[PDB]
Design a protein around this ligand. Structure first.
Ligand SMILES: O=S(=O)(O)CCNCc1ccco1
Length: 658
């Protein structure tokens, strides 16, 4: 239908604008829709963009506001002292500030709907909240409203929450518009979604993005499709992938690289109240932290991830147990049968389940998908679903039968409650993925598996050598294959930390010279150098000019192909902050051929220093633009848990950085 009111080009310079004379008489009925295109790249800590208030003395709490914080959060307030109603709905990390230097125009759509009794907010096409109340307060039935304000809320005749930005365009409607209509509002988005709520993964949440340009020009991406909110394992998490054949302008409908079936794939809205936000899926096996490379020789595409048996994450993973028993040079996967309190079985050659005590093989075997067969017959378990209908989290058998897998809770045979690493391959560049294979122990029979560094593995330009960085207590443990991933050898590089999350990423500065940048506990990014193609490693140094937080953040890096100011160039993606995971940057370094030192010459501000930026993926797109897929939020912050569509992708050019 038609806007009862429409205005545009409002400047918010810490002075509010009065539009009462225009809007207040238009307002009628109990349903309204605000549509607001606005810019704010230098906002104050807390500012109101829009306000409906009772400016009369004695009614400071009778108002409606649409506000933002300089954290990127957006919210509304609906308050009536006489009615006894005080509503505040919001979401962190809902905004953009700047992109490529210019300020971003955000597209805000707030719906107030008296039929479903529901407040819904969309920003830049994404639904950031939708709240139902039992007692609905139409934004226009607030007692004694006499003001309509932009850039403030007019309380008791003063300008509260003074704003800094602009509203290019604002429309008002005496209707609550439908979803379908909402989707037809044009956007000015500086970004796109590759993975997103409601897509084929059915995961409502995503974390830990990766990017890799393949030899065909196809760009591939892998990610954590996280179902139980944005929690680490333990949870349900699958590895999803999607590709682009047109330099990241469009992306394929995602498919699974690694998935488990013990729990259903459920698009669940996870509770954000303090009483319930730490609810965590506790019976599911899961995957977490993927890394990808292309192998020249085979043409194969290779993906690794951490594997977690039902109910397992890194905080409770059995350290001091690789999950394998060594029998004469060979590592065998161990199993526990129900009723036993010790592990008495192994998976020998041809997946035969052998009893270690009796020394007789058994009538059970383990297939390639780690499913259990008895006497050649496939066994099954019942699937679980999660819900919050009882007011708290509840995992329960949903009726469906799925292949019994030794990583599952209900399995008759179970692996060691510890962390594993697995690989899968694609012969077709992301179109399908093989059944994953578990990797062997690297640091011993009685030492838990290491942790895959998420992002890219490295394909050395002058051999068939493939390296995947992993970490454990006290060292990076690089995994090396010279045979297209069929076999693997470890290369240990000690670091001066214990229990650090040393997420690492490598660049080749020239033939056989590998620089790795990894996350520390120091507030600085560290690095080390191999000069014999990852055989041995230098001592640890640190970069000054970038700061991280004490707990740090994942860092992605690539060796750029074109020269920049005449030099070889390495690009770096990281939050630059000591407060939290915000202030994202791409940092450009020129290499000094004399000594292989790096002069970090350019810093690109991805967005505002106060807006969230966490784990990231960069890649050189086939047209020499830079593709960036990142967590646009503070994935550490306890206040920013469980947001949808905060992992976003952008296209940058080199000159944008310089
Ligand atoms: O810093 S955070 O990214 O929030 C924590 C990530 N933990 C990494 C991990 C690896 C295996 C299980 O968890």
């Amino acid at each position: 239908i038609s806007p009862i009111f429409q205005g545009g080009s409002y400047q918010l310079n810490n002075k509010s604008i009065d539009i009462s004379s225009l809007l207040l008489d238009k307002l009628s009925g109990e349903s309204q829709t605000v549509v607001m295109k606005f810019k704010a790249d230098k906002p104050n800590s807390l500012q109101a963009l829009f306000g409906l208030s009772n400016s009369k003395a004695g009614f400071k709490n009778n108002y409606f506001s649409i506000f933002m914080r300089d954290s990127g959060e957006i919210g509304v307030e609906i308050r009536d002292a006489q009615k006894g109603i005080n509503y505040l709905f919001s979401r962190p990390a809902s905004l953009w500030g700047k992109h490529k230097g210019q300020a971003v125009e955000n597209t805000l759509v707030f719906v107030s709907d008296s039929k479903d009794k529901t407040y819904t907010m969309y920003v830049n096409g994404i639904e950031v909240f939708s709240e139902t109340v039992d007692t609905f307060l139409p934004i226009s039935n607030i007692n004694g409203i006499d003001k309509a304000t932009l850039g403030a809320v007019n309380r008791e005749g003063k300008e509260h929450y003074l704003a800094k930005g602009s509203i290019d365009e604002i429309s008002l409607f005496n209707k609550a518009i439908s979803d379908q209509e909402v989707s037809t509002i044009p956007l000015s988005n500086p970004f796109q979604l590759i993975f997103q709520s409601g897509d084929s993964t059915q995961a409502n949440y995503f974390r830990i993005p990766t990017l890799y340009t393949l030899s065909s020009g196809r760009v591939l991406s892998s990610i954590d499709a996280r179902y139980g909110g944005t929690h680490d394992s333990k949870s349900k998490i699958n590895i999803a992938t999607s590709y682009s054949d047109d330099n990241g302008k469009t992306w394929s409908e995602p498919i699974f690289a690694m998935k488990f079936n013990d729990y259903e794939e459920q698009l669940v809205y996870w509770p954000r109240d303090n009483k319930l936000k730490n609810s965590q899926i506790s019976g599911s096996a899961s995957f977490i932290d993927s890394s990808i490379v292309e192998d020249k020789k085979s043409g194969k595409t290779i993906l690794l991830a951490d594997v977690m048996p039902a109910g397992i994450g890194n905080n409770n993973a059995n350290k001091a147990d690789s999950g394998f028993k060594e029998i004469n040079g060979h590592y065998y996967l161990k199993l526990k049968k129900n009723g036993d309190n010790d592990f008495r079985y192994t998976v020998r050659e041809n997946g035969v389940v052998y009893n270690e005590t009796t020394n007789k093989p058994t009538n059970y075997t383990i297939n390639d998908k780690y499913e259990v067969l008895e006497g050649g017959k496939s066994l099954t378990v019942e699937q679980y679903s999660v819900d919050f209908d009882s007011g708290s989290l509840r995992e329960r058998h949903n009726g469906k039968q799925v292949p019994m897998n030794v990583f599952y809770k209900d399995s008759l045979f179970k692996v060691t409650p510890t962390n594993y690493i697995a690989m899968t391959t694609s012969q077709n560049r992301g179109e399908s993925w093989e059944q994953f294979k578990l990797l062997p122990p690297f640091l011993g029979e009685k030492h838990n598996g290491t942790y895959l560094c998420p992002g890219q593995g490295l394909a050395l330009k002058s051999s068939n050598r493939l390296i995947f960085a992993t970490y454990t207590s006290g060292e990076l443990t690089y995994l090396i294959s010279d045979d297209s991933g069929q076999t693997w050898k470890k290369s240990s590089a000690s670091i001066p930390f214990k229990n650090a999350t040393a997420e690492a990423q490598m660049v080749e500065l020239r033939d056989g010279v590998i620089r790795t940048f990894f996350r520390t506990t120091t507030g600085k990014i560290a690095y080390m150098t191999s000069r014999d193609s990852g055989e041995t490693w230098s001592k640890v140094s640190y970069i000054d000019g970038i700061q991280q937080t004490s707990y740090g953040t994942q860092v992605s890096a690539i060796k750029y192909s074109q020269l920049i100011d005449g030099k070889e160039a390495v690009i770096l993606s990281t939050p630059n902050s000591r407060s939290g995971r915000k202030g994202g940057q791409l940092v450009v370094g020129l290499v000094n051929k004399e000594d292989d030192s790096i002069d970090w010459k350019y810093h690109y501000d991805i967005d505002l220093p106060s807006y969230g930026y966490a784990y990231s993926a960069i890649t050189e797109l086939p047209n020499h633009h830079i593709g960036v897929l990142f967590e646009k939020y503070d994935s550490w912050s306890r206040n920013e848990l469980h947001l949808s569509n905060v992992v976003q992708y952008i296209d940058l050019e080199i000159n944008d950085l310089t």
